[PDB]
């Protein structure tokens, strides 16, 4: 029984597939309708092939014959070749996101704010013109009727604004704030020593988790908000019917 | 013994030559392994930055939406003024509503001012106390606060959610009762 | 960059401006905030 074991060992260490003992199958993904192709080749036992297809992880996968080490090396070769492609595409995505963010964070924000202020200014001008129109043309001395109500409202709000107390409260508040300003700044300068305790005390790990929990909350909150929004928009419909 | 002693040499040499390939596999693993492990961390990162942009753009939508309806009413209010002058060169009862409208609008803005003022009072009154304790006193203790906050927000959200669901279902009830 | 945008938005939020209504809101936090949450 000696020259049999030897031949069997010589057979084991070989790509000829006489019980190669390095028989493992790897599933290569292939989209339909290419499944009908592949289609093994020289020394494939339909037993192994079907048994591979039997315990299939997901559809559109075809098994691949990995006999020994050069094959697994090759599989690695491919894996790197795809690694680089993955990283590249990912970087593309990254770059386009940077572009979008650069646009928004600078080019668009400024134009939004600027446009809003321009609107306010033009609103003022619009009311000014819309006011002078009601002056020069309507200077026929016959200005009355609904004017009384207008000047009544105007007088009410104007009287409400032009009050000593209401106007005084702000002035009192400001100084009332400056008191705390000075007091706080003094008490702060006094206790302006605990810096390392503060910086190191704050810098931690729970902060990262808290950020995550915050994002989750934000998502939940957004969802709820939009849900209510829809609940409103969907109700004002029923309000008509 | 020649053929045998030579055959064993060739065989053992071939096997050893195969084990060299096995080793070649073993060598090219850890690097590639790191490279592989790197991927999910980046895609799990880039997916986050995308969410940032989306939350940013989506926030940018409402900005224009506001700016859209603003210029449109300013377009009309600036248009209602010229048609009055163009009518003159060759609506007085209409602008009254506009002025009284601006008045009615501002009438609440003043109330907002009052509200915010009262809040500011109520707030600074607290600032006083905070400083009044901070002067009196003169890391790990506050970490508990954060948790105590978040675990409470969970509850508050879960509280609100019920209200929301109740409303929504309450609306669908009427919606149903309509075509039912 | 999400939380960053949340900060940035909540940063630009409490900082003006001339928008005919929306003035910057004062931030609280921690002690006052918990009670302010409970008073919901």
């Amino acid at each position, epitope marked *: 029984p000696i020259p049999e074991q030897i031949k069997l060992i010589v057979d084991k260490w070989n790509p000829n597939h006489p019980n190669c003992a390095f028989k493992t199958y790897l599933y290569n993904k292939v989209d339909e309708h290419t499944v009908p192709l592949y289609g093994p080749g020289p020394n494939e036992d339909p037993k192994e092939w079907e048994e591979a297809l039997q315990r299939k992880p997901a559809p559109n996968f075809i098994p691949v014959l990995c006999s020994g080490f050069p094959s697994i090396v090759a599989r690695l070769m491919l894996q790197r070749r795809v690694i*680089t492609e993955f990283n590249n595409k990912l970087h593309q995505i990254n770059a386009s996101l940077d572009a979008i963010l650069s646009r928004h964070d600078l080019d668009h924000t400024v134009r939004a704010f600027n446009a809003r202020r321009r609107h306010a200014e033009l609103s003022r001008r619009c009311l000014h013109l819309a006011a002078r129109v009601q002056v020069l043309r309507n200077r026929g001395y016959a200005l009355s009727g609904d004017e009384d109500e207008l000047k009544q409202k105007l007088q009410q709000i104007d009287k409400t604004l032009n009050d000593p107390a209401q106007g005084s409260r702000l002035e009192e508040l400001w100084s009332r704030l400056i008191v705390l300003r000075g007091y706080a700044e003094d008490l702060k300068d006094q206790i302006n020593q605990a810096g390392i305790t503060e910086s190191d005390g704050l810098g931690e790990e729970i902060e990262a988790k808290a950020k995550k929990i915050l994002e989750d909350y934000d998502k939940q909150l957004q969802h709820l908000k939009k849900q209510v929004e829809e609940a409103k928009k969907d109700f004002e419909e029923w309000e008509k019917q | 013994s020649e053929a045998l002693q030579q055959e064993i040499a060739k065989i053992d040499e071939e096997i050893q030559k195969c084990i060299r390939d096995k080793e070649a596999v073993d060598a090219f693993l850890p690097a590639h392994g790191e490279q592989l492990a790197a991927i999910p961390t980046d895609v799990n990162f880039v997916t986050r*930055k995308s969410e940032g942009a989306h939350n940013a753009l989506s926030s940018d939508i409402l900005a224009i939406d506001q700016l859209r309806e603003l210029v449109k009413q300013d377009a009309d209010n600036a248009r209602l003024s010229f048609k009055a002058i163009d009518n003159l060169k060759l609506s007085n009862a209409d602008l009254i509503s506009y002025f009284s409208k601006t008045a009615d609008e501002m009438e609440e803005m003043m109330k907002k001012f009052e509200k915010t003022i009262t809040e500011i009072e109520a707030h600074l009154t607290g600032v006083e106390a905070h400083a009044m304790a901070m002067q009196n006193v003169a890391v790990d203790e506050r970490v508990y606060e954060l948790a105590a906050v978040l675990r409470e927000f969970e509850e508050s959200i879960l509280k609100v959610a019920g209200v929301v669901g109740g409303v929504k279902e309450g609306v669908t009830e009427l919606q149903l009762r309509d075509f039912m | 960059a999400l939380f960053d945008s949340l900060l940035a938005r909540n940063k630009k939020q409490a900082e003006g401006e001339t928008a005919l209504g929306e003035l910057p809101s004062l931030q609280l936090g921690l002690a006052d905030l918990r009670q302010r949450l409970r008073k919901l």
Partner: antibody
Amino acid sequence: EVQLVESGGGLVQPGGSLRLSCAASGFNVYSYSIHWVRQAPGKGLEWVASIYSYYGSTYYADSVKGRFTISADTSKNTAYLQMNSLRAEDTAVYYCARLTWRSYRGVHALDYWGQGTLVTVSS
Amino acid sequence: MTQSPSSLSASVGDRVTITCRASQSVSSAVAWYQQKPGKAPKLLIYSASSLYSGVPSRFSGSRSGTDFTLTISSLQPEDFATYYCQQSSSSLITFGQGTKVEIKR
């Protein structure tokens, strides 16, 4: 759709002062960290200084500590290298660059360089 | 101590391999760069071994202990330029002496 425009270089007397400007286009400067790297004529590359705004960190090479001062305007979205107490040995072509997608971990590599500006210090 | 690179040379299509030895063996953070005369530096390899986007496959970076290596399996008429490595120790980015390759004849 990404570039680094470099300016502010040129001629200057010894012991003088300059402010190099690296205007970045295609990405927020705050999100990334920007680096300066000069190259002396006929010599190799020399790292000068780094700035990352979102962290608020600044780092300088031994050969320019205290003398130089890097910064960056987030609103203008531009980096600046303030050079003081210059010497004849500071004569070099100054380049500006950035790191990989954010940091991201500890993957320090300069992907996008500019075309650089030549700073000549001579009497 | 700004230094100039060691100018080596070889014929076209020769298998070239360049090596830098970091005083502090690093985890990753070792970039390799190419630079042609008059033109700024460009990135080749990053994270020691990860090839960068927009780089031919003939460039292949690797590591062996404390020594990092840039391999060009086939030198091309466009591969004639100066090559630098980069150490990074958080921080103080250090550039190697560099290495210029020239066509042999």
